[PDB]
């Protein structure tokens, strides 16, 4: 039952909520909720680039085009860090990923992907989360 209390959406929510409070308090950033579909970061990026998540298909399409035009290089390495690098280069802006952690200063990006050159453009910042979801476990037998 310790397992269960620990995985309760209650404790997970409290952590995610604390993480929101921290980001705001330490960096002044605000996590904005995107619509829930897939492991896709296209909605989050669209909000970062266009101020509108419903532009996700535009972002996805350019990303796919940019990957494909750069196949040989990207071939060396779904595969979200590949998408993230592509999008940093294509928008020429750094992409920063944030995530809850109990390590020191969770409020620092867990990783930063760089565009082509440095400039004064605001970085693209996204939030990595893993949301509780239940499926149905069927027994045909």
From Swiss-Prot:
Entry keyword set: Disease variant, Hydrolase, Intellectual disability, Nucleus, Phosphoprotein, Protease, Thiol protease, Ubl conjugation pathway
Outcome recorded upon mutating residue 127 to A: Reduced phosphorylation. Reduced ability to promote stabilization of BTRC
Modified residues (Phosphothreonine): 11
Annotated effect of mutating residue 136 to A: Reduced phosphorylation. Reduced ability to promote stabilization of BTRC
Region annotated His-loop, chain positions: 128-133
Any one GO MF annotation of this record: cysteine-type deubiquitinase activity
Function: Deubiquitinating enzyme that functions as a negative regulator of the innate immune system. Has peptidase activity towards 'Lys-48'- and 'Lys-63'-linked polyubiquitin chains. Can also cleave 'Lys-11'-linked ubiquitin chains (in vitro). Acts via TRAF3 deubiquitination and subsequent suppression of type I interferon (IFN) production. Controls neuroectodermal differentiation through cleaving 'Lys-48'-linked ubiquitin chains to counteract degradation of select chromatin regulators such as ARID1A, HDAC2 and HCF1.
The protein, known as: OTU domain-containing protein 5
Organism for this UniProt entry: Homo sapiens (Human)
Span covered, complete protein: 185 to 342 of 571
């Amino acid at each position: 039952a310790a397992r269960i209390e620990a995985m309760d959406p209650a404790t997970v929510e409290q952590q995610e909520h604390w993480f929101e409070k921290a980001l705001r308090d330490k960096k002044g950033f605000i996590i904005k909720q995107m619509k829930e579909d897939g492991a896709c970061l296209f909605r989050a990026v669209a909000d970062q680039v266009y101020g509108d998540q419903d532009m996700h298909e535009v972002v996805r399409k350019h990303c796919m085009d940019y990957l494909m035009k750069n196949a040989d290089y990207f071939s060396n390495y779904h595969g979200n860090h590949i998408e993230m690098q592509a999008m940093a280069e294509m928008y020429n802006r750094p992409v920063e990923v944030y995530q809850y952690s109990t390590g020191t200063s969770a409020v620092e990006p867990i990783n930063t992907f760089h565009g082509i050159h440095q400039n004064e453009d605001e970085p693209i910042r996204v939030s990595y989360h893993r949301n509780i979801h239940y499926n149905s476990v069927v027994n045909p037998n």
